[PDB]
């Protein structure tokens, strides 16, 4: 596997018309899945990271918006990156998106990190685009290779003992951080339980405590649940994604939680911006906005 050639070919379409595909060989994509899978299993399922770091929300196959994120924040390894999941589905170029992220994970394993989102799940991305894209451009056997890779992604991260990061949100079953460490890999995402809630739950300003989620899966949680969680675990902030927000980032519970969404003009139906959060060594957080182009 020649990583540098794969990365160079993925970055070649920088500045081209949006939608221009990159043609990697099936064995090259298979090598990205197999080698990145090994690195995921060699690293904790609950990542403990250090600032400075840039944190990004959902990409959803919007590859050229991903390139905008790297051009704005600096291509690896100029900056460390943490992605919060949902790399495939909805968008038109899920393959280019995940292939570049996996390539950077192999190239800079200590400076580039990827969390699991609810769309890194075979039952979900079978419906919402990634299966169709794999079948159209390659084959279904490749889609299954991606599933084996997705099944080993880490679930959460804690930055400098203070920022708890996950795709979805909190769980009523999440009482100790060691519960996350006891999640075994490889694994599918269950329809209910701790691993499900971490990828599916949402904050809600109207709910007090826990409530039912209109998605039909997992829960909603209120501001007091966030406050008690941060106090119990001596954390300052929850950083999550999962939901599209108008400004690319959105605060919750008096800035005790922030939602990051990095796909501008999501699905072509929303007029939203995208955002990443920069965390410096003093944990000072700022937001870099991608306006919809």
């Amino acid at each position: 596997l020649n990583l540098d050639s794969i990365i160079g070919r993925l970055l070649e379409v920088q500045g081209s018309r949006p939608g221009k595909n990159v043609q990697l060989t099936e064995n090259e994509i298979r090598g990205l899945c197999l080698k990145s899978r090994e690195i995921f299993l060699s690293q904790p399922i609950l990542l403990e990271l250090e600032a400075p770091l840039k944190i990004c929300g959902d990409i959803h196959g919007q590859y050229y918006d991903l390139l905008r994120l790297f051009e704005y924040g600096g291509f690896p390894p100029e900056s460390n990156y943490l992605f919060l999941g949902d790399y495939v589905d909805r968008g038109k170029q899920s393959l280019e998106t995940i292939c570049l992220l996996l390539a950077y994970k192999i190239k800079y394993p200590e400076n580039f990190f990827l969390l699991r989102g609810n769309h890194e799940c075979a039952s979900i991305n079978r419906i919402y685009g990634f299966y169709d894209e794999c079948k159209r451009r390659y084959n279904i056997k490749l889609w299954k290779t991606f599933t084996d890779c997705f099944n080993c992604l880490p679930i959460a991260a804690i930055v400098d003992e203070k920022i708890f990061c996950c795709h979805g949100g909190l769980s009523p079953d999440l009482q100790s951080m060691e519960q996350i460490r006891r999640i075994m890999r490889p694994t599918d995402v269950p329809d209910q339980g701790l691993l499900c809630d971490l990828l599916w739950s949402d904050p809600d300003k109207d709910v007090q405590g826990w409530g039912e989620n209109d998605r039909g899966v997992s829960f909603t949680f209120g501001a007091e649940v966030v406050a008690k969680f941060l106090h119990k675990h001596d954390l300052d902030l929850i950083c999550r994604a999962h939901q599209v927000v108008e400004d690319g980032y959105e605060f919750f519970a008096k800035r005790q939680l922030v939602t990051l969404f990095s796909a501008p003009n999501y699905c072509g139906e929303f007029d939203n911006a995208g955002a990443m959060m920069s965390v410096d060594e003093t944990l000072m957080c700022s937001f870099q906005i991608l306006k919809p182009a």
């Binding site: 694994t187 339980g193 405590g209 826990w210 829960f219």
Partner: protein, 173 residues
């Protein structure tokens, strides 16, 4: 949506090494079967679940079976509200050590009786089975405790029922 101020049931899984205590526990919580054997020191798992239309918090303590890993086992057992005594139908010694674990539970809890269930695991290995169903029911009746047969391998057999039945014993329901 879980109710407020729920009761917590501290369930402790004890038994000889290799009988499947961790595989049953991970199957119960994560709904997957782990084929590899990694000996347990101590691990704990937590879930909110509704049993017989009554919400409950299930705190499951998974203990060590190997004697080399068994230091501090009695302290973790001391905190329990109920116990699963697990043996493997393919391991004769694990069945014969049920008496030892039964005695340890009563000694550590300082009681004459305590909620426990005898769990006969690995019944999916029919060609390797060495402990009959009658032997298990005899052992359970001798101790006046319920008997159940389980398999952690997919598709799982009686895994959720074993933990839920222990909660039923604690409730006296």
């Amino acid at each position: 949506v879980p109710s407020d101020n729920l009761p917590t049931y501290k369930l402790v899984v004890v038994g000889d090494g290799g009988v499947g205590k961790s595989a049953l526990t991970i199957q119960f919580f994560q709904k997957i079967f782990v084929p590899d054997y990694d000996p347990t020191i101590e691990d704990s798992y937590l879930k909110h679940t509704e049993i017989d239309n009554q919400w409950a918090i299930l705190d499951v303590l998974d203990t060590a079976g190997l004697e080399e890993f068994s230091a501090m086992r009695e302290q973790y057992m001391r905190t329990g509200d109920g116990f699963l005594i697990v043996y493997s139908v393919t391991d004769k010694a694990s069945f014969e050590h049920v008496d030892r674990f039964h005695q340890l539970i009563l000694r550590v809890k300082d009681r004459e009786s305590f909620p426990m269930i005898l769990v006969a695991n690995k019944v999916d290995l029919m060609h390797l089975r060495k402990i009959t169903r009658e032997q298990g029911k005899e052992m359970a009746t001798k101790h006046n405790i319920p008997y159940i047969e389980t398999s952690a391998k997919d598709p799982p057999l009686n895994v959720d029922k074993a933990f839920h039945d222990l909660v039923r014993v604690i409730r006296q329901q």
